[model samples]
Target: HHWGYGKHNGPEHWHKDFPIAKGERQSPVDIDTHTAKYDPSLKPLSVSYDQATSLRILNNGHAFNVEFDDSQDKAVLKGGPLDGTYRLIQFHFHWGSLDGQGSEHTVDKKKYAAELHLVHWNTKYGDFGKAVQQPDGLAVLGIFLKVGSAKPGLQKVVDVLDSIKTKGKSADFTNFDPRGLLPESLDYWTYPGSLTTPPLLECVTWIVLKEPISVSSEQVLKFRKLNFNGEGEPEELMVDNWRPAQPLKNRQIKASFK
Candidate 1:
């Protein structure tokens, strides 16, 4: 029962046209967090940035999406890997609207027009919609955006993107601030992943942020000027909502500020 709703039914064709799509998993790949030993008591116990958080902008049809909740967004990971208490449960972005490309995380293999996700949940292995049905409970934080000129936490959320314009639309983003799209060297990269979308649960624990946060070109076309399509031929109105490049299946990626 896996489902997708963007980029042609999204998540790169949902497991080859469904069938539980082999459980699902596929998403960008620029994770370099500059490795080589890092353990400030296992990281994230304090990370703040809130001019206003608790933003929620959804066009559920798929594109124009944004959700970020705050409370100093957490992360107190312990021990060698999956430990506990991870909070920060919202942060989203995936773009495409002409300009160099769009995004979907791909450095060498190429495919970086736009991409951003910062979903976290492990509240001591519980709430996060029930630890996302546990696999180790989730913890995602991948950021890879590229367009240029005007990336200060996404031009203030694209200056409010014309106040949510259509289709299952949503709004309520007072002030907003996810550390202005973090990327001043939290220097991260950790592994054991899954869930690029759908029930692709592998119980993620990825923290990819080698540093990158910028948005322009009209804030990446305000999510490709959204449309949520209806009548044949222009319905899939998103430029390149990216999601492809998965399968380090051997799993084992760790990095930290070197």
Candidate 2:
């Protein structure tokens, strides 16, 4: 009945409920810089989002998720390891209890303070539910978060954390440009992978950005304040909410730049 970061229901135990946990195309694999093939043919990734599309920010018991109005292509992703356009549906983060070694996907065994996943569904499949079942249904733009300078761009999202401190809590969050979170460089590594969480369907075309966005250590401290426990429940803090790197298997990882 539960799948969480706790010792009882964490990533290691997910296979008990979802057999696909051990599937060939699992996600958050370790990216060895030396092994990934460089493809000059890959196009630069494009992302466009309408601030008005941001509807709510919720503490979903698992992560802090920002939901979007995807009835139309108001927020969409195009090009780079994607055959067609994908509509933005939601975005969330995963992080460690501490500032070090929190990112799911590691490069050369180097980890960051946290990671961000901007989820999109292929328009060809009509919606997220249907698209998630197909092999080429989703594309997640993964960005690592490093702790250093304060990011006012991220502060907008961080400032709203207090309203949704408990599990299942939500607050209206609108007119915020999600595009500002991205770093200056568009370079990334691409691969065919599955969701890092349960119901690990192998339907994602992962685009992990090479560069990380800076977030103040204080900003991430606020992130840890959010609780996984619901109202009147025992207070359980949310942290170390990341899946360990899965085996890369025989899959090939391609880099947009050499």
Candidate 3:
């Protein structure tokens, strides 16, 4: 009831509702490869996802999210810059009205068509709602999406979009292996930042992968059809949902790649 992507309630106005939007350590920062420190100490990422954990898909108005069963250690992320295991809660995307630029995090100032976020809560914190407030609460794996040949695994996800075209609408999305959506290389850039959304809690440790996955132009267009407004409200296209890159400030970004 207090936030949106209109001129009156867009990213520029977020600081008014959530002061942390202007916090020192914000997310979706431009990743300059030339300046990133290649830390040999960073371990290779360890990702284990169970197909059975995938439950349902929801049109949360902000974005279309695929929820997972985090009651157990079915799908967990470890290693890399993480000190403890993190449980996968959900995954969502951010895109623009057009493909020129939609990604939140850019590399060398190059924007992609879109970006995917796999949200995970630190097991040490017990639950996602509580973890979001702690210093080391969340870990989000960012994957860039580019327009190209259709990715078969992703088509299954795209196929279900019609069922959840409007906010509050959802359908059972079971036995869907989210890991199939990832690229081959897990090499990434790691940094400390806040959530790209409202509340903007500065508790997330971002792990943005270097390589991007492909999505057909038609497939990408399907995402644009999603409406931000639920039943009884004027329809609004859910595009350009990504937050612009914030200043790097004094934070250091480490690379798992050379």
RMSD of each: 16.9, 0.9, 1.0
Question: Where does candidate 1 clash, by residue pair?
Answer: 6-10, 44-75, 102-113, 102-114, 103-113, 103-114
Order the candidate numbers by TM-score, best to worst: 2, 3, 1
Question: How much is 119 displaced in model 3, in angstroms?
Answer: 0.6
lDDT of model number 3: 0.92
Candidate 2 per-residue C-alpha lDDT over 1-258 given as tens digits, one digit per residue, 9 for 90 to 100: 699999899999999999999999999899998999999999999887754389999999989999999998899999998999999999999988888878999999888989999999999999899999999999999999999998788988999999999999999998878888999998999999999988899999999999999999999999999999998999999888899899999899999998
Off by over 4 Å in 1: 1-37, 40-141, 144-186, 189-191, 203-207, 217-219, 226-255
Could you estimate the TM-score for every candidate?
Answer: 0.30, 0.98, 0.98
User: Residue 16 in candidate 3 has what lDDT?
Assistant: 87
Candidate 1: tens digits of C-alpha lDDT, residues 64-123: 666655354333333335465566656666666566565655554555557787676776
The TM-score between candidate 1 and the true structure equals 0.30
lDDT of 2 at 104: 93
lDDT tens per residue, model 3, 32-126: 99999999999999998854388999999999999999999999999999999899999999998888899999999999999999999999888
| Lowest lDDT 10-residue stretch of candidate 1 | 70-79
Model 1: lDDT of residue 4: 47
